[PDB]
Write a protein that binds this ligand. Structure first.
Ligand SMILES: NC(=O)c1ccc[n+]([C@@H]2O[C@H](COP(=O)([O-])OP(=O)(O)OC[C@H]3O[C@@H](n4cnc5c(N)ncnc54)[C@H](OP(=O)(O)O)[C@@H]3O)[C@@H](O)[C@H]2O)c1
Ligand SMILES: CC(C)NC(=O)C(=O)O
Ligand SMILES: [Mg+2]
Ligand SMILES: [Mg+2]
Length: 466
């Protein structure tokens, strides 16, 4: 697929249009700031003078009320929570917008699941950054960007795609790479990625590793540090150089440990569970369940957030990060190398087997994980969870423990015990006397694999001039 960069895209299609950004949260603030820095005409539209109104004023915007912003808009962007969009649309947009104004989304959920039926005489299109909102901004302001999908649901001008690409450039995404997709593909892959790996999976893997180290007798501060530091090292290596590059950066013993432990901790049953998660998404069952939860007041989301914020793991992480700010395990290596490699691989391959563009699968299940893990490293799980959408919070909370279930810390424990006893060392010394056939066989299968051949091509194009 074509991966569009800055030199491929003109801003001219949006140059003199008034762009109304509805909402000023995680994506909304990022888009508004980025678009304004890129020279475009932005107004911020809000329902209320609340927290995000105050934030927008502090950033030099003068927000308008939603109905007033949409009256003067050529392009209307829905950057409020997915569950809120129908109500905003019905009450503040539909009867107030210019006739023919563009309707623009950052996630396909409402259009794809037919929650909002747009008018027939508007362009309807999407730019979906494959990044948490704050990193859309942070990348842009460092002179870089994050990847994005664009899609067109309804073309009435005949230039909807060019306008989507222009907006993607305007928010910095063409510095990294933009791929054309569909509302269906974006929605399905996006919900899948956040549920199984980007929010749900990684969060539960981190908790499992932390708990397991603590049960084995490590002090909490050491269990936290070992977990998150090794996670960052491993995910950074993959982000830069793929699975093969990561494996070549660690010892042969760690290669063998990673490879074997990974398939133990993350086994076929997990691949089956990922397909279940995908079908629940495809069939509309997730959407119906999320709508029902939302209409109850999102009690599951509020509960989880408040338990997480108060938890031992988050208290310990906050204390650790603060002590590091102010200046003040080889089992864990292989458990994480294995667990993260096989979770990535299973997530990516599920999407590719199901027919989605492999490039989209790579942005969603590989590239974006580095951005997530950077947020976790900097701000803890609670900071990460605050940055992601409510849809992703709910998906992660419900699916994460399905993918990484209780048994995974049980398997971790077993592996950790074999390491501590010197049993893992005997086992490495042996496979080694067979000429490391398990290691060479895996390197050989990785070399030819879709994830590595696509990743290498994309990483070359992405890090071109970034
Ligand atoms: N978060 C991510 O990184 C991410 C990644 C890619 C795409 N997406 C997509 O981007 C879109 C926006 O998601 P987001 O997470 O950026 O949104 P968000 O941060 O949750 O949105 C908060 C904004 O929406 C307003 N809002 C909250 N409840 C509202 C209500 N009942 N009525 C009207 N306005 C309300 C808030 O105003 P107050 O301050 O007054 O409450 C605030 O301006 C979604 O389609 C999402 O799927 C998000
Ligand atoms: C992981 C997260 C940033 N991605 C999303 O698509 C979202 O927040 O909904
Ligand atoms: Mg996403
Ligand atoms: Mg999402």
């Amino acid at each position: 697929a074509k991966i569009y960069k800055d030199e491929d895209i003109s801003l001219e299609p949006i140059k003199n249009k008034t762009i109304a950004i509805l909402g000023y949260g995680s994506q909304g603030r990022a888009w508004a700031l980025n678009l304004r820095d890129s020279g475009l005409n932005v107004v911020v539209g809000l329902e209320r003078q609340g927290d995000s109104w105050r934030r927008a004023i502090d950033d030099g915007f003068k927000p308008m009320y939603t109905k007033d912003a949409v009256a003067i808009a050529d392009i209307i962007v829905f950057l409020v929570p997915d569950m809120v969009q129908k109500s905003l649309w019905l009450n503040s947009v539909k009867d107030f917008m210019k006739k023919g104004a563009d309707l623009v989304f950052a996630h396909g959920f409402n259009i794809h699941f037919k929650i909002i039926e747009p008018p027939k005489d508007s362009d309807v299109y999407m730019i979906a950054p494959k990044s948490p909102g704050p990193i859309v901004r942070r990348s842009y302001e460092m002179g870089g960007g994050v990847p994005a999908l664009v899609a067109v649901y309804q073309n009435v001008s005949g230039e909807a795609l060019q306008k989507a690409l222009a907006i993607a450039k305007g928010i910095g995404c063409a510095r990294a790479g933009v791929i054309e997709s569909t509302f269906k593909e974006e929605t399905e892959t996006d919900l899948f990625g956040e549920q199984v790996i980007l929010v749900g999976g990684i969060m539960e893997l981190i908790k499992a590793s932390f708990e397991t180290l603590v049960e084995e007798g490590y002090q909490p501060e050491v269990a936290y540090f070992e977990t998150v530091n090794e996670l960052k090292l491993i995910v950074d290596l993959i982000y830069e150089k793929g699975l093969t590059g990561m494996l070549r950066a660690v010892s042969d013993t760690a290669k063998y440990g990673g490879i074997t432990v990974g398939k133990f901790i993350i086994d076929k049953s997990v691949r089956d569970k990922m397909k279940i998660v995908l079908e629940r998404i495809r069939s509309g069952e997730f959407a119906r369940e999320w709508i029902k939860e939302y209409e109850r007041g999102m009690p599951t989301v509020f509960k989880e957030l408040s338990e997480l914020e108060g938890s031992t793991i988050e208290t310990v992480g906050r204390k650790l990060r603060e002590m590091m700010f102010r200046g003040m395990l080889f089992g864990e290596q292989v458990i994480l190398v294995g667990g993260i490699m096989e979770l990535i691989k299973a997530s990516f391959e599920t999407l590719v087997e199901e027919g989605y563009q492999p490039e989209v699968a790579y942005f969603e299940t590989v590239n974006e994980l580095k951005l997530i893990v950077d947020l976790i490293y900097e701000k803890g799980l609670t900071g990460m969870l605050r940055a992601v959408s409510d849809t992703a919070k709910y998906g992660g909370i419900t699916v994460g423990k399905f993918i990484i279930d209780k048994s995974v810390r049980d398997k971790m424990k077993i592996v950790l015990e074999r390491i501590r006893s010197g049993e893992f060392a005997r086992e490495w010394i042996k496979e080694y006397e067979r000429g490391m056939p398990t290691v060479f066989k895996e390197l050989s299968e990785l070399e030819g694999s879709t994830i590595e051949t696509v990743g290498r091509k994309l990483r070359e194009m992405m890090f071109r001039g970034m």
